[PDB]
Coordinates of C-alpha atoms and ligand atoms in Angstrom, one line a residue:
X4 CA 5.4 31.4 18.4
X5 CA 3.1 30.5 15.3
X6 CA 3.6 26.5 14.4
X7 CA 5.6 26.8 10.7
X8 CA 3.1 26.9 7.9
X9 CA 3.3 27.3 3.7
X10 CA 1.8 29.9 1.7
X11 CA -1.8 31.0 2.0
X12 CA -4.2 32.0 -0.6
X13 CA -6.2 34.7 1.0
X14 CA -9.9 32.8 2.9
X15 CA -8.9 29.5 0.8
X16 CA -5.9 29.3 3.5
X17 CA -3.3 26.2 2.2
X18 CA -5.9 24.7 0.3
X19 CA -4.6 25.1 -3.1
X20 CA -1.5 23.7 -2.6
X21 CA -3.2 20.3 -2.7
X22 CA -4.1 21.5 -6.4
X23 CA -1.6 18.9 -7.7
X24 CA -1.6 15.4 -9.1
X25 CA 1.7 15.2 -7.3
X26 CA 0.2 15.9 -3.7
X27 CA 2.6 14.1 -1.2
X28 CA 5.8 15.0 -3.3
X29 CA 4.5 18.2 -2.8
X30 CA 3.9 18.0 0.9
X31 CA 7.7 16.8 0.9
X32 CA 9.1 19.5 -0.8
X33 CA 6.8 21.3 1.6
X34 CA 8.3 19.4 4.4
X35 CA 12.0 20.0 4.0
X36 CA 11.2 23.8 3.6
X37 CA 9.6 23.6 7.1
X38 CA 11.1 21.0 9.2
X39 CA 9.7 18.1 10.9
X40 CA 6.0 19.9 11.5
X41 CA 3.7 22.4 9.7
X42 CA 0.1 23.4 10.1
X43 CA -2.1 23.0 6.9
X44 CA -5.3 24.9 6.7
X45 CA -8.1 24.6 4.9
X46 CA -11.6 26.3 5.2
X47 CA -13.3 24.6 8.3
X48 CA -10.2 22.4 8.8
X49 CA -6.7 21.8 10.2
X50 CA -4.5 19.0 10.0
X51 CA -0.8 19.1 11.5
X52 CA 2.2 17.1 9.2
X53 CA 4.6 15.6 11.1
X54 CA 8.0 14.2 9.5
X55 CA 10.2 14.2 12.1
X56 CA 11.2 10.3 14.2
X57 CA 11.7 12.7 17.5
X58 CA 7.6 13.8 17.0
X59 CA 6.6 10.3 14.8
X60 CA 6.9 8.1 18.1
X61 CA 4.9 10.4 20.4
X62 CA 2.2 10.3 17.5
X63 CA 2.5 6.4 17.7
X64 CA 1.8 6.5 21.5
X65 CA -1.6 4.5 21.1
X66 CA -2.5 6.0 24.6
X67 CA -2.4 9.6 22.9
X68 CA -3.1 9.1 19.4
X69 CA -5.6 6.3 18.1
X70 CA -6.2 5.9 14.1
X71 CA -7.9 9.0 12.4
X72 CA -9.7 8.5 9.0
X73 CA -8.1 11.5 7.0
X74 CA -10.9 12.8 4.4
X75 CA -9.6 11.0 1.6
X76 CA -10.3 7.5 3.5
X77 CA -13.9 9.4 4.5
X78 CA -14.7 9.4 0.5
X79 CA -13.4 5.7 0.3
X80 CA -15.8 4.9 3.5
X81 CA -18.5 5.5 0.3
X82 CA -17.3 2.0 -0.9
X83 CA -15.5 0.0 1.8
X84 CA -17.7 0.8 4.7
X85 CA -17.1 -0.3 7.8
X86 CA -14.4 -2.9 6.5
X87 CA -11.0 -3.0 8.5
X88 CA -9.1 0.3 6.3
X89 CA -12.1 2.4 6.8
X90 CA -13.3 2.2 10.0
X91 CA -12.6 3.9 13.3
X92 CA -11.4 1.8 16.4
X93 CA -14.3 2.4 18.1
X94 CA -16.6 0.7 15.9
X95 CA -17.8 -2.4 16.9
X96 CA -17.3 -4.4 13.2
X97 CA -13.2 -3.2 13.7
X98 CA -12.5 -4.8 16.4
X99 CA -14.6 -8.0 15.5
X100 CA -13.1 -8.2 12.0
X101 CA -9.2 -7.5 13.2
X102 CA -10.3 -10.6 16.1
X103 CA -11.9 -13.0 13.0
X104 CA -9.1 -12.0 10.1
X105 CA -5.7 -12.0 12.1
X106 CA -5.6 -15.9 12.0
X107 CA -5.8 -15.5 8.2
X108 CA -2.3 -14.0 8.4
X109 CA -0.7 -16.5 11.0
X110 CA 2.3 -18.9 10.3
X111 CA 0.2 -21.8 9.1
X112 CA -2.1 -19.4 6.8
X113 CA 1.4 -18.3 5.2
X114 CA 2.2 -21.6 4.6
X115 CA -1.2 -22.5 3.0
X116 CA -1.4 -19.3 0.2
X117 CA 2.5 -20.6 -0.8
X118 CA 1.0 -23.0 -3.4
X119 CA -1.6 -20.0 -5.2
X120 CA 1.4 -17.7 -4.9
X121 CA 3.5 -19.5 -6.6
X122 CA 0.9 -20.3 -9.4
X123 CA 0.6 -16.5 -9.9
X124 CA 4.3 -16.0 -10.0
X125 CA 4.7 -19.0 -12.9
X126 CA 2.3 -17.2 -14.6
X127 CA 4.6 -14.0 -14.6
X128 CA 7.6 -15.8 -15.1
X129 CA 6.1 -17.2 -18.3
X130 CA 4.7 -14.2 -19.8
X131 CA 8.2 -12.5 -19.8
X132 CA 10.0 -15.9 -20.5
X133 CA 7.7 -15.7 -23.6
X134 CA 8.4 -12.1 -25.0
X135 CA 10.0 -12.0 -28.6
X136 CA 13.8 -10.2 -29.0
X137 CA 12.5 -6.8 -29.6
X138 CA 9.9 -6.3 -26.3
X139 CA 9.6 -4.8 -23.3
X140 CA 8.0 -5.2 -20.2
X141 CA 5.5 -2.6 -18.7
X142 CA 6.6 -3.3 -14.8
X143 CA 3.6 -1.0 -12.8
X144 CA 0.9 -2.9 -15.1
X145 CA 2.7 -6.4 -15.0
X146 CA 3.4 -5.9 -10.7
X147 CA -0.6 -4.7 -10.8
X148 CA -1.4 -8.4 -12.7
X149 CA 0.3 -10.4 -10.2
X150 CA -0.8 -8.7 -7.0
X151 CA -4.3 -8.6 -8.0
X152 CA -4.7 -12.0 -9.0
X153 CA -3.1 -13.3 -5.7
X154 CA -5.4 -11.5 -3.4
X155 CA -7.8 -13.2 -5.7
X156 CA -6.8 -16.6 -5.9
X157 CA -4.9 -16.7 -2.1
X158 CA -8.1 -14.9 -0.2
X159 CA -11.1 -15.7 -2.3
X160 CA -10.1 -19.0 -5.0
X161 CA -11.3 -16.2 -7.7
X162 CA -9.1 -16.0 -10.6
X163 CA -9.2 -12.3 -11.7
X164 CA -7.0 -13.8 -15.0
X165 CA -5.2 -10.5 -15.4
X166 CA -2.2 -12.7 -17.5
X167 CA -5.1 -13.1 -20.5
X168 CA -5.9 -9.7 -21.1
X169 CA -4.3 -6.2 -22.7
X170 CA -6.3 -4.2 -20.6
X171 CA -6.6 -4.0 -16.6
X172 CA -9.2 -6.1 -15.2
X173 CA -12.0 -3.7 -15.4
X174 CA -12.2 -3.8 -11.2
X175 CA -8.6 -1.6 -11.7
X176 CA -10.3 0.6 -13.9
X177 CA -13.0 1.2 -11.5
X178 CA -11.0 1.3 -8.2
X179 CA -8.0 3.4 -9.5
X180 CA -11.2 6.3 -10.8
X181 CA -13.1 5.7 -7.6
X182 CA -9.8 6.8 -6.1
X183 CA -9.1 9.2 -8.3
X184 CA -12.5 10.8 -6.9
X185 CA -11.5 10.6 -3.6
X186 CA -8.7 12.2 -3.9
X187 CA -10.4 15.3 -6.1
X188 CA -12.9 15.6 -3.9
X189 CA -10.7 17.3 -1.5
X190 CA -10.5 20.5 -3.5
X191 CA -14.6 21.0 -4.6
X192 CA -16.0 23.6 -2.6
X193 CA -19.9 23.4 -2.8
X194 CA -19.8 19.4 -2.9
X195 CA -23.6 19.7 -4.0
X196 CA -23.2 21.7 -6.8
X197 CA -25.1 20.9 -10.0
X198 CA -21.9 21.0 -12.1
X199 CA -20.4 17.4 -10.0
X200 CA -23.8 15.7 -10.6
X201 CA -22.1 13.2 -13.6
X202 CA -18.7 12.5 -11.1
X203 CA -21.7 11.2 -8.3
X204 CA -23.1 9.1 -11.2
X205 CA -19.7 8.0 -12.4
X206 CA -18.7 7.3 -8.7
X207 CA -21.6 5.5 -7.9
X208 CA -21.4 3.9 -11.6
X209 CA -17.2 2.3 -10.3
X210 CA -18.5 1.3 -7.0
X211 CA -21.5 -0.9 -8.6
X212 CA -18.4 -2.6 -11.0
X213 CA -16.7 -3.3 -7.8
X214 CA -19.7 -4.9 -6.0
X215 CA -20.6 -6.6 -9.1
X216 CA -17.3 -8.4 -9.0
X217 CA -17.9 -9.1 -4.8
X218 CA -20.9 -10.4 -6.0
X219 CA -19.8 -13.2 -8.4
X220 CA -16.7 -14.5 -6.0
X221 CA -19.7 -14.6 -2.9
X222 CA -21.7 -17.0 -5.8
X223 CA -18.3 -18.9 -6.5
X224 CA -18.3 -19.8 -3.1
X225 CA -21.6 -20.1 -2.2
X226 CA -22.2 -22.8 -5.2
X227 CA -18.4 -24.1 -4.5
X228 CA -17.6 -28.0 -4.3
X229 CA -14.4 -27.4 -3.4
X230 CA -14.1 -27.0 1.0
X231 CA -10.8 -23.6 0.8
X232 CA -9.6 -22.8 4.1
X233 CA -8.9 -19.2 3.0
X234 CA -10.0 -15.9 3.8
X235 CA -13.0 -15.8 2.8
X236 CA -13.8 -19.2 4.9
X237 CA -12.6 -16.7 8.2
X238 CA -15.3 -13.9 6.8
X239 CA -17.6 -16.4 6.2
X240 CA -17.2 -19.2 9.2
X241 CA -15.1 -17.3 11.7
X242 CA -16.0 -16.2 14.8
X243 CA -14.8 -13.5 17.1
X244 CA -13.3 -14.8 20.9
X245 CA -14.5 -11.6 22.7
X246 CA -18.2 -11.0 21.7
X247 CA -18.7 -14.6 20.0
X248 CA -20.0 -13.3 16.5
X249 CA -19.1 -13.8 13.4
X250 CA -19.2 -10.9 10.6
X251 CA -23.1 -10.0 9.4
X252 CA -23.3 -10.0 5.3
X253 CA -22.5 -6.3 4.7
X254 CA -19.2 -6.0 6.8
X255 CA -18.1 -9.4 5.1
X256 CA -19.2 -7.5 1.3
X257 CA -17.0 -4.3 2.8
X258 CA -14.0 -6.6 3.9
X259 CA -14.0 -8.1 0.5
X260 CA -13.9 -5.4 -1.1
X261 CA -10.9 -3.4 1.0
X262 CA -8.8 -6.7 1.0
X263 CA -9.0 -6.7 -2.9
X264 CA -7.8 -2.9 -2.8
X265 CA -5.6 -2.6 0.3
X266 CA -4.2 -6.6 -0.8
X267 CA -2.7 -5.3 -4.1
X268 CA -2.3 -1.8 -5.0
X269 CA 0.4 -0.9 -2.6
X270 CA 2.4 -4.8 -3.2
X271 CA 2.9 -3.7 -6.7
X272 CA 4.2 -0.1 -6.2
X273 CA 6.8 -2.0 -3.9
X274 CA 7.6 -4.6 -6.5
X275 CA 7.8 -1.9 -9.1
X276 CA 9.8 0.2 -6.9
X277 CA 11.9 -2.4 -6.0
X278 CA 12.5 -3.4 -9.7
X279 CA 13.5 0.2 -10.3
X280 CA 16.1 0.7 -7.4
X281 CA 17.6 -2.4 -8.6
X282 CA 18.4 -1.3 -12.3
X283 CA 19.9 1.7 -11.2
X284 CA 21.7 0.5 -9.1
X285 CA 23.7 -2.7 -10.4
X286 CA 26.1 -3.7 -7.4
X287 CA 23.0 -4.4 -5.5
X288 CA 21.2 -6.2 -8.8
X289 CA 24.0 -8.6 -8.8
X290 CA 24.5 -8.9 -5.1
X291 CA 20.5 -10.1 -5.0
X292 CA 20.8 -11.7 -8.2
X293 CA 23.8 -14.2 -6.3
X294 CA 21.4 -14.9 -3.3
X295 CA 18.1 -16.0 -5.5
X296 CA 20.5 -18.8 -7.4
X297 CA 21.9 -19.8 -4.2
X298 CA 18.8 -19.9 -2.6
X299 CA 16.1 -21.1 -4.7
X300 CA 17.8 -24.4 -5.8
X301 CA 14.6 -25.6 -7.0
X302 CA 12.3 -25.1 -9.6
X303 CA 9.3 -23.7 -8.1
X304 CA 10.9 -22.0 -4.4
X305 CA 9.2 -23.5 -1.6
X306 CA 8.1 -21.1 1.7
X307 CA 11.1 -21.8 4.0
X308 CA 13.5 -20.8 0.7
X309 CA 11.3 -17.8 0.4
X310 CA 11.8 -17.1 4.3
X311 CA 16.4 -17.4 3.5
X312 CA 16.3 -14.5 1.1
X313 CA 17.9 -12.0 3.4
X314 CA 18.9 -9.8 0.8
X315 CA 15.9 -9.6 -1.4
X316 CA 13.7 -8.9 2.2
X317 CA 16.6 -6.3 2.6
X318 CA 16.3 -4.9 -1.0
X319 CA 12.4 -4.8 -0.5
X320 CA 12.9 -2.6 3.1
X321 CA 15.1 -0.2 1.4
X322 CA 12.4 0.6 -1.1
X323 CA 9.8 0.7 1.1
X324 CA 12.1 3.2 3.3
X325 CA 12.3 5.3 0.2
X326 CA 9.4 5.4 -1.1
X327 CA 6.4 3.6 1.0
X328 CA 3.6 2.9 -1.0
X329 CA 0.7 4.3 1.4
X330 CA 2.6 7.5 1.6
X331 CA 0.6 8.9 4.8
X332 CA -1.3 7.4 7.5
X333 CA -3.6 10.1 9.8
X334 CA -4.2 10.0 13.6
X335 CA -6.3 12.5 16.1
X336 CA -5.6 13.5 19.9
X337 CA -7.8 11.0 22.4
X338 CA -7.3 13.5 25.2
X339 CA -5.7 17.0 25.5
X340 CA -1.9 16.8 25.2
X341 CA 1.6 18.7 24.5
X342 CA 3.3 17.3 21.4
X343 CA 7.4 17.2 21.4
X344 CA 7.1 19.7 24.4
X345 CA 6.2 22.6 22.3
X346 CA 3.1 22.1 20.6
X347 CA -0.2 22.2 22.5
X348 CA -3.1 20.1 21.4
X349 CA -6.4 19.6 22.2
X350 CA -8.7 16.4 21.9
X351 CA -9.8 15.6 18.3
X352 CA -6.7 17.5 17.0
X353 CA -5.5 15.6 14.1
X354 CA -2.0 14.5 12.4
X355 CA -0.8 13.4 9.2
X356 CA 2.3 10.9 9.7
X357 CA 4.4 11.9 6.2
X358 CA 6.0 8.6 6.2
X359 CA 8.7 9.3 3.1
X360 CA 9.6 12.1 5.7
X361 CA 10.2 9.7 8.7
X362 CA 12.1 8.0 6.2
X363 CA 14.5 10.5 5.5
X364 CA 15.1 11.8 8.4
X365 CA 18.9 12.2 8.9
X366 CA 19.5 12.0 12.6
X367 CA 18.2 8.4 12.3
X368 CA 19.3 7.2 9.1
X369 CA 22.8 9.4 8.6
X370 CA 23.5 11.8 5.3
X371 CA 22.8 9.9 2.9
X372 CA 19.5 9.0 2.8
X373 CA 18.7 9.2 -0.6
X374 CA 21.0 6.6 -1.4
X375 CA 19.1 3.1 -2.0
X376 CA 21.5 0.8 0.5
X377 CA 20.0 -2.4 1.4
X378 CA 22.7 -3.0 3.9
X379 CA 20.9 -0.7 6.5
X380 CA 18.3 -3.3 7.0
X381 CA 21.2 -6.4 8.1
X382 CA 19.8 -5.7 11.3
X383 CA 16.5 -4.5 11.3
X384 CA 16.9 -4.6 15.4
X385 CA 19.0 -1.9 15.1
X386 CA 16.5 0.7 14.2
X387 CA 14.8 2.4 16.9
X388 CA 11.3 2.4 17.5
X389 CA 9.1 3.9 15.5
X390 CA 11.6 5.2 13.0
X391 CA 10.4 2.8 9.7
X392 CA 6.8 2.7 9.7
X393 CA 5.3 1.7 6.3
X394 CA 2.7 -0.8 7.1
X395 CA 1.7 2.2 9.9
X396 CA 1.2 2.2 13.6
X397 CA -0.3 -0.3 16.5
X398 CA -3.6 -2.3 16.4
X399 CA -3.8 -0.4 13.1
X400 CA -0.8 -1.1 11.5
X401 CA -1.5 -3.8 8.4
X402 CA -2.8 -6.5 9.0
X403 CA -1.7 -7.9 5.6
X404 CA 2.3 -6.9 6.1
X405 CA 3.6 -10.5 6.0
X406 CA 1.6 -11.5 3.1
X407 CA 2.8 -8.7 1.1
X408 CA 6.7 -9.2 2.2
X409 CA 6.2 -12.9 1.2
X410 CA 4.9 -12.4 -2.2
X411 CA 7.1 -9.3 -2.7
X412 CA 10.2 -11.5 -2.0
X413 CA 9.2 -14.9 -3.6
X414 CA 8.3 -13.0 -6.8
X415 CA 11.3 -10.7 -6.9
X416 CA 13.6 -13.9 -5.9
X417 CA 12.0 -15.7 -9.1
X418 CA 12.5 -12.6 -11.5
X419 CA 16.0 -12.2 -10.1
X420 CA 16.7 -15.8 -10.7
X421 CA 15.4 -16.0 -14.1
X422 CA 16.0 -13.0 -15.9
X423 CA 19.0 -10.3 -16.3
X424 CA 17.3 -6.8 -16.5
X425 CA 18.0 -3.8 -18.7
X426 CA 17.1 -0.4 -17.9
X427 CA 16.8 0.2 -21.5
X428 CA 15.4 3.6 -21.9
X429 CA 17.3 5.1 -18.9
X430 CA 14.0 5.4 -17.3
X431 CA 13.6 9.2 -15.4
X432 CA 11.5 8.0 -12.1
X433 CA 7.9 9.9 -12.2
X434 CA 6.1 9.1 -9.3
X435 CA 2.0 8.8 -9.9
X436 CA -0.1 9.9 -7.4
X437 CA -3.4 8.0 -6.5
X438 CA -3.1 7.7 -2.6
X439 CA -0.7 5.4 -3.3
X440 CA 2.1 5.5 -5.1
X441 CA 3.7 3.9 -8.3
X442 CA 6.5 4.4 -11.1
X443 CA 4.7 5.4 -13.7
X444 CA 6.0 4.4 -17.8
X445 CA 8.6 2.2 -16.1
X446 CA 9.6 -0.3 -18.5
X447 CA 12.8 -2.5 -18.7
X448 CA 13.9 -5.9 -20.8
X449 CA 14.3 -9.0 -19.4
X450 CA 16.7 -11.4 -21.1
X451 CA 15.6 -14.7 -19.4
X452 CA 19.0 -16.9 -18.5
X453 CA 16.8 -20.2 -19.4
X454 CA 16.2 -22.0 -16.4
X455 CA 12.9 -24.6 -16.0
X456 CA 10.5 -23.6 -13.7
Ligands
LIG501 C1 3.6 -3.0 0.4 C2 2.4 -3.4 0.8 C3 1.6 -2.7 1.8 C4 1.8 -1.5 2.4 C5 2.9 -0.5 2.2 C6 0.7 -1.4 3.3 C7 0.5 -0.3 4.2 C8 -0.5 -0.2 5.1 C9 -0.7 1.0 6.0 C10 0.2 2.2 6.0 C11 -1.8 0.7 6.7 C12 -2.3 1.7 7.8 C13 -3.3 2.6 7.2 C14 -3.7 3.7 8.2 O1 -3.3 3.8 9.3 O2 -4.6 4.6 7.8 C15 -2.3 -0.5 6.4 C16 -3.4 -1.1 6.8 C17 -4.0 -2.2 6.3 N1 -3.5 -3.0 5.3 FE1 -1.9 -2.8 4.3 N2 -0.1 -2.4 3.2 C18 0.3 -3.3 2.3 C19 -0.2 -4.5 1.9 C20 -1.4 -5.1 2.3 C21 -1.9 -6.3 1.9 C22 -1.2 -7.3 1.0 C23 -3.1 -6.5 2.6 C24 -4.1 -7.6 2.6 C25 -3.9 -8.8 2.0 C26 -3.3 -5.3 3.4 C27 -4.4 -5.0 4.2 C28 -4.4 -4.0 5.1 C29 -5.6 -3.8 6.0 C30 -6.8 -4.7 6.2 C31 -5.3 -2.7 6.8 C32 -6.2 -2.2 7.8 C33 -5.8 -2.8 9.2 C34 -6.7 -2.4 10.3 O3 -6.7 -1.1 10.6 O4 -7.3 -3.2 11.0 N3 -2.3 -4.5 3.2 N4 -1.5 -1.1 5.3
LIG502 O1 -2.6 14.5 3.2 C1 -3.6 14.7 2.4 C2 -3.3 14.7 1.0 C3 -2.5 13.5 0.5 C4 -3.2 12.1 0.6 C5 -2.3 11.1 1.2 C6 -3.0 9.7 1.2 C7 -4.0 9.6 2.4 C8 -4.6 8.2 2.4 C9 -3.6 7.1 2.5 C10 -2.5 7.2 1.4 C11 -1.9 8.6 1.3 N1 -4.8 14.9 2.8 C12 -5.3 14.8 4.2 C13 -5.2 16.2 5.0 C14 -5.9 17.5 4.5 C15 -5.3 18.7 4.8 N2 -6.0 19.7 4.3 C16 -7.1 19.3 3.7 C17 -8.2 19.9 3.1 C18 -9.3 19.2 2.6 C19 -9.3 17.8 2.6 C20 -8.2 17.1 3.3 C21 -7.1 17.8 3.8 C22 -6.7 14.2 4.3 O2 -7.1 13.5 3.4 O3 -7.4 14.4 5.3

């Protein structure tokens, strides 16, 4: 037996078919041709795709399988360093750093970002509450305003200000073409070729923007009258229980930079996704719409309101089931072992995890698992282990998973509140493609229903 596999291209093997802008739609397509694993070769290089729940929860055996760092994440390395995405269990700075940052993300941390949360929200609510009878809203590049200035404000007390500007906050500019890199430097054979000189100079060119920018919100602290108890104050002050260190300067600068990325990008595809499902699908609009003006009673929501909206949590589940915003997360064999009881692997042997795969599979879910149905999350007990995994696996799932769901749902439980939303130009879904993933031209109108905040 040979392991199923796509079309080759002669010595370039599967390589090619990661010639796309659309790579993990095409690895999906690839995917339900194939079943729930395939081999992908490339010259030098073999990954296995798994899509399958049955082969998904061996993979997430953390005895077996520990956190690989697929090549695109080895091209973001360049940038975030040893900083909690980018670096491998066994390094010394993860451990520390997961240890220093978790209590950033506890109950009473939660509580604390509510306040700079909500100010970013009000700020949203306001820009669309001011919008003249003709316009529209651009929902990928609002959802990337919010998100980015809370990681700013919540983790750092910077205010990125993305509400007074036209254009992205030149950071996004940077980061999404730094990304953009990484994710064409898969295909270059002869990296060191004279013809990719300017994209090393134009790499090296985003990162410096991005480490400009750590640079000023270190100085903001650093000359800061103001005491924050944020997360910064952890990277700064905190200090590991096990070896009794805090973080040195250039892990702190690498952690800074991957919580602005990893504490944004992925919260506004979900908003944005979430958005989407809900114009197309009206029943469920209106059934979300009737818990956010039951709920949030007042006029700014306060955490434990945030914590009652059920639905909207339920809503915001559904799209991440559909269509989860870090697509993929990779893993590699710690020992030598025999995967689903038919597929032999030796140590370092590595696997993708196709998450929108796990997510469809139909001896989990049922039939109809391109339907956008909230109601499968009433109990989210009820799913089996390791069937819904978009904030990945173990000690290496996200550490930032409760801060996104609470931001998610406050802001979507304030949209749904004060606005009635019209899929106005039918909008045809067109998935972008930049690791993550987003809705790209989707617009809607908002008619606000003129409520005080
Ligand atoms: C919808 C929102 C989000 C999704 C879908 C998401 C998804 C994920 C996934 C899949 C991983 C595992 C990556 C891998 O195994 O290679 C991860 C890790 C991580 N996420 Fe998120 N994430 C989200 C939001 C956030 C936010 C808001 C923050 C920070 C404020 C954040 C910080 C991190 C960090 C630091 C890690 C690395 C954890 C570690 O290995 O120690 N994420 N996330
Ligand atoms: O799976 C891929 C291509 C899609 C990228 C998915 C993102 C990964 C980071 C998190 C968000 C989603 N690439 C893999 C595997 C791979 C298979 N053949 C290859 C040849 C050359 C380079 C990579 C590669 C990866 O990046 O390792």
């Amino acid at each position: 037996k040979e392991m199923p596999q796509p079309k080759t291209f002669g010595e370039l093997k599967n390589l090619p078919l990661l010639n796309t802008d659309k790579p993990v739609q095409a690895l999906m397509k690839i995917a339900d041709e194939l079943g729930e694993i395939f081999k992908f070769e490339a010259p030098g290089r073999v990954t296995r795709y798994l899509s399958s729940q049955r082969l998904i929860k061996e993979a997430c055996d953390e005895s077996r399988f520990d956190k690989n760092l697929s090549q695109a994440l080895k091209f973001v390395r360049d940038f975030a360093g040893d900083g909690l995405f980018t670096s491998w269990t066994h390094e010394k700075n993860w451990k520390k750093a997961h240890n220093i940052l978790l209590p950033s993300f506890s109950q009473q941390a939660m509580k604390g970002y509510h306040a700079m949360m909500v100010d970013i929200a009000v700020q949203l609510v306001q820009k669309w509450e001011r919008l003249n009878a003709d316009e529209h809203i651009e929902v990928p590049e609002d959802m990337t305003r919010l998100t980015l200035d809370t990681i700013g404000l919540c983790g750092f007390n910077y205010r990125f200000n993305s509400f007074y500007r036209d254009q992205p906050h030149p950071f996004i500019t940077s980061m999404v073409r730094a990304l953009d890199e990484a994710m064409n430097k898969l295909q270059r054979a002869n990296p060191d070729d004279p013809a990719y000189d300017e994209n090393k100079r134009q790499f090296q060119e985003d990162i410096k923007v991005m480490n400009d920018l750590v640079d000023k919100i270190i100085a903001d602290r650093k000359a800061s009258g103001e005491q924050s108890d944020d997360l910064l104050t952890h990277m700064l002050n905190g200090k590991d229980p096990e070896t009794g260190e805090p973080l040195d300067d250039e892990n702190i600068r690498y952690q800074i930079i991957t919580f602005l990325i990893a504490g944004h990008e992925t919260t506004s595809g979900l908003l944005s996704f979430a958005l989407y499902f809900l114009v197309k699908n009206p029943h469920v609009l209106q059934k979300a719409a009737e818990e956010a003006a039951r709920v949030l009673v007042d006029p700014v929501p306060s955490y434990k309101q945030v914590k009652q909206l059920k639905y909207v949590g339920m809503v915001l589940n559904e799209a991440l089931r559909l269509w989860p915003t870090a697509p993929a997360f990779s893993l590699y064999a710690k020992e030598d072992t025999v995967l689903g009881g038919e597929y032999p692997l030796e140590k370092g042997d590595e696997l993708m995890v196709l998450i929108p795969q796990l997510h469809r599979d139909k001896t989990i879910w049922g039939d109809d698992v391109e339907e956008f149905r909230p109601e499968r999350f009433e109990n989210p007990s009820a799913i089996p282990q390791h069937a819904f995994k978009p904030f990945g696996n173990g000690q290496r799932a996200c550490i930032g998973q409760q801060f996104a769901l609470h931001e998610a749902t406050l802001v979507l439980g304030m949209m749904l509140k004060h606005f009635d939303f019209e899929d106005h130009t039918n909008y045809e879904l067109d998935i972008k493609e930049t690791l993550t993933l987003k809705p790209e031209g989707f617009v809607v109108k908002a008619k606000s229903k003129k409520i005080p905040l």
